[PDB]
Each structure stands twice: as structure tokens, then as C-alpha cells.
């Protein structure tokens, strides 16, 4: 029942890495409530107000030679340093997907068959999941939940396939992920 | 672009809540427990390769509070607009009776970063073994958050993730049950 006005202050120090640390872009974003008002982009070299609220600050910080020089070295002293420290368990993190196939536990339309290909606990998020009706990618009648974050450095994604149970058919879910040298496959005995 | 590391911090008035965390491609590397004055690694293994002096975070937060006070006045005391959360409940993995699993309550796209989340089993609150993440940053400056509930699948149990937020007309309930 607390309806008092809230006032929020956010500050984000961003380090964007391209091709290893070949190219690094440092960014300081100051956000009031939900509006970024001040920003320091390593590509610009100085603070600049994004909204009027940051104008006073941009003018002040820029007039601070020492400070301004420190922020100009962030790409190295801050960004590359941290990247070096965390690379081993972040940039290099890799967890193989656990693939399982099964028919949806709930069905609407009863002559068709909803097959579910669950790809669980993988990392990085980059992944390719495809269906194959014996040796023909059923690019049609395929719906996916898209990439889903579990919040614990693992992703999951379900790719459903609408089918019609016919004797002799052997559906196969094929998964490609950077954690494996060859694609993972799981067949479904119809 | 390939990888992004973000040091995200915030201070909220009048709640007087502050947060300091590091994000790597949308996942939390660690955050600092303001109360215990200690760094908390998202995954235990992280702390076996890196360290972080929590005192550094505490200093930044005290500064953020001081800065907020000035910004609040400078803005003519304009408060933040409540943006209600999107809530989804899912399982860590495909369920199977008697196989331990985890229920995930994902609270997304909301602000300010204050939310009350509760887990309900057959209508009664449950807290045994539950855990949660701090508020995670979004590029639009709203927030994300994860709540977890380990459980033993049962065809007789019905679970709810109950979410409260000032931007909601009523508390929200997201249902999940074996089926």
C-alpha cells in the first residue's frame, strides 16, 4: 500500500569486446529513473549529455582533465583487464545441450501428433535445432519457444513439430552447438 | 559485436536500496551483498578464478545515493513511472515424476526494482530450498529477475508464482502443474 514516489539512480559501465579484445568500446551510462541522461563513449573521448538533466554534469566532468584522462584509459585499465580476468569462465564457457524428444503432454486436434524436441542446459546461447522426417528437414509445421535463459548460465529451447503418426516413419531432432564437434541427433520411434 | 561486460549499479529512494553487479552477455557474474558487505558469485566456480573487493561496490553505492539526491532535485522531483512485470513460469527441464527438478519464475521488463515474489504449493506458501537472483539490467533500463523452486514432481501438486509490483492493479499469479 506504499504509493510514495520512487526516485531511481542507475550507472552502467559497459565494455564491448570485438574479436577478442582487438577492438574495445568503453561506455559509462548514467540513468535517472528510466532515462539515460549522461554518457561517456570511449569513441568520443568526452562526456556528453543525452538529455537536459545530464547537461550540468557533462560540462563539469569534461573540464576535469585528470578525470577525463582516466576515463579515456578505461578501455585498457578496466575493460581489457576484467576481460583478461574473466575470459576463462565466461568467454570460454561451454556446456553441451541435453537433447530429449517426446510428444506434448497436452494435445488439441487428435489425429495429428505434437512432437517436442527439448534442448536443455546449454551455453553459449547460439544453437541450431532442426527436424528430419527420415532425411528431409521438416522446415514446415515447426514452432519454437526461441532462446530461453534460465538465469544460471544455461539456456533451454523447445522446438515442437506437428506431425501425423504413420507406420515406418523415423523423425530425428538434429542439434548444432559450439560445444560439440558434430551435431547431436535424437530419433523418435513412432 | 562478440561479448559485453557490464558493471551495473543502482540506488533507490525512498526504499534506500542499492545494488552492484557485473553482467556478462545477459548473465550475472556476481553482485555485492550490501548487508554482509561481501561479493556473491553467481556460480561457485567463478570465485575460484576471480576476486572482487566488495568495499569498492559499497563506496560506489554511497556515491550513487548522494548523486541521486542531487538528480532528484535537479529533475524537479519527477518520480519514476511504474512499469509492471511480465511473468512466466517454467521448469528447468522436462518433468518426470519422482525426478528432482526446479521451477523457474521469470519476472521481466519492470521498474522500479522492487518486487515481492512468493511460491505457492496447492495454495500454501513454500520457502524450503527456494533461491533468487538480484535485479538484472536490461538495455531499456528496466529489470529482469529469477526466482527458483526445487521440487519433486507430483501429479497432485499445483504451484503458483505470485508477483507483486506497484505497477500492477492486482498481484499476479502464474500457474504450473504436472501435465
Amino acid at each position: 500500500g506504499d504509493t510514495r514516489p520512487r526516485f531511481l539512480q542507475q550507472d552502467k559501465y559497459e565494455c564491448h569486446f570485438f574479436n577478442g579484445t582487438e577492438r574495445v568500446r568503453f561506455l559509462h551510462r548514467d540513468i535517472y529513473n528510466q532515462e539515460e541522461d549522461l554518457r561517456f563513449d570511449s569513441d568520443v573521448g568526452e562526456y556528453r549529455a543525452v538529455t537536459e538533466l545530464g547537461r550540468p554534469d557533462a560540462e563539469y566532468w569534461n573540464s576535469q582533465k585528470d578525470f577525463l584522462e582516466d576515463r579515456r584509459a578505461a578501455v585498457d585499465t578496466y575493460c581489457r583487464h576484467n576481460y583478461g580476468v574473466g575470459e576463462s569462465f565466461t568467454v570460454q564457457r561451454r556446456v553441451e545441450p541435453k537433447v530429449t524428444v517426446y510428444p506434448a503432454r497436452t494435445q488439441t486436434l487428435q489425429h495429428h501428433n505434437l512432437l517436442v524436441c527439448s534442448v536443455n542446459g546449454f551455453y553459449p546461447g547460439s544453437i541450431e535445432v532442426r527436424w528430419f522426417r527420415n532425411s528431409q528437414e521438416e522446415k514446415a509445421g515447426v514452432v519454437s519457444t526461441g532462446l530461453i535463459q534460465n538465469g544460471d548460465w544455461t539456456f533451454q529451447t523447445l522446438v515442437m513439430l506437428e506431425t501425423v503418426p504413420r507406420s515406418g516413419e523415423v523423425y530425428t531432432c538434429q542439434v548444432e552447438h559450439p560445444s560439440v564437434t558434430s551435431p547431436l541427433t535424437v530419433e523418435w520411434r513412432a | 559485436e562478440e561479448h559485453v561486460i557490464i558493471q551495473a549499479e543502482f540506488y533507490l529512494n525512498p526504499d534506500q536500496s542499492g545494488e552492484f553487479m557485473f553482467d556478462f552477455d545477459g548473465d550475472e557474474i556476481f553482485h555485492v551483498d550490501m548487508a554482509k558487505k561481501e561479493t556473491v558469485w553467481r556460480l561457485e566456480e567463478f570465485g575460484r578464478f576471480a576476486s572482487f573487493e566488495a568495499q569498492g561496490a559499497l563506496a560506489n553505492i554511497a556515491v550513487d545515493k548522494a548523486n541521486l539526491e542531487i538528480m532528484t532535485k535537479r529533475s524537479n522531483y519527477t518520480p519514476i513511472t511504474n512499469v509492471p512485470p511480465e511473468v512466466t513460469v517454467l521448469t528447468n527441464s522436462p518433468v518426470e515424476l519422482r525426478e528432482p527438478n526446479v521451477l523457474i519464475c521469470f519476472i521481466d521488463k519492470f521498474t522500479p526494482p522492487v518486487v515481492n515474489v512468493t511460491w505457492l504449493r496447492n495454495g500454501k506458501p513454500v520457502t524450503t530450498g527456494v533461491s533468487e537472483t538480484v535485479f538484472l539490467p536490461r538495455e531499456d533500463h528496466l529489470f529482469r529477475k529469477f526466482h527458483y523452486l526445487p521440487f519433486l514432481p507430483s501429479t497432485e501438486d499445483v504451484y503458483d508464482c505470485r508477483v507483486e509490483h506497484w505497477g500492477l492493479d492486482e498481484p499476479l499469479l502464474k500457474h504450473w502443474e504436472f501435465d
Binding site: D11, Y13, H28, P56, D57, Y60, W61, F67, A74, T77, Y78, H81, N82, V85, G86 | Q7, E9, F20, F22, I29, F30, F49, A50, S51, F52, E53, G56, A57, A59, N60, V63, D64, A66, N67, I70, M71, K73, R74
Partner: peptide, 20 residues
């Protein structure tokens, strides 16, 4: 001298008072 690797945090400075 085992050596410890620390993540570094950017230090946020105090905003000056508006004055008057």
C-alpha cells in the same frame, strides 16, 4: 605469493553541488 586476480570496478565520483 599465490597471486589473486581481481575484477576492477570503475569508481563513480560525487556529483558537485549546484551551488547557491
Amino acid at each position: 605469493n599465490p597471486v589473486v586476480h581481481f575484477f576492477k570496478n570503475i569508481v563513480t565520483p560525487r556529483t558537485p553541488p549546484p551551488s547557491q
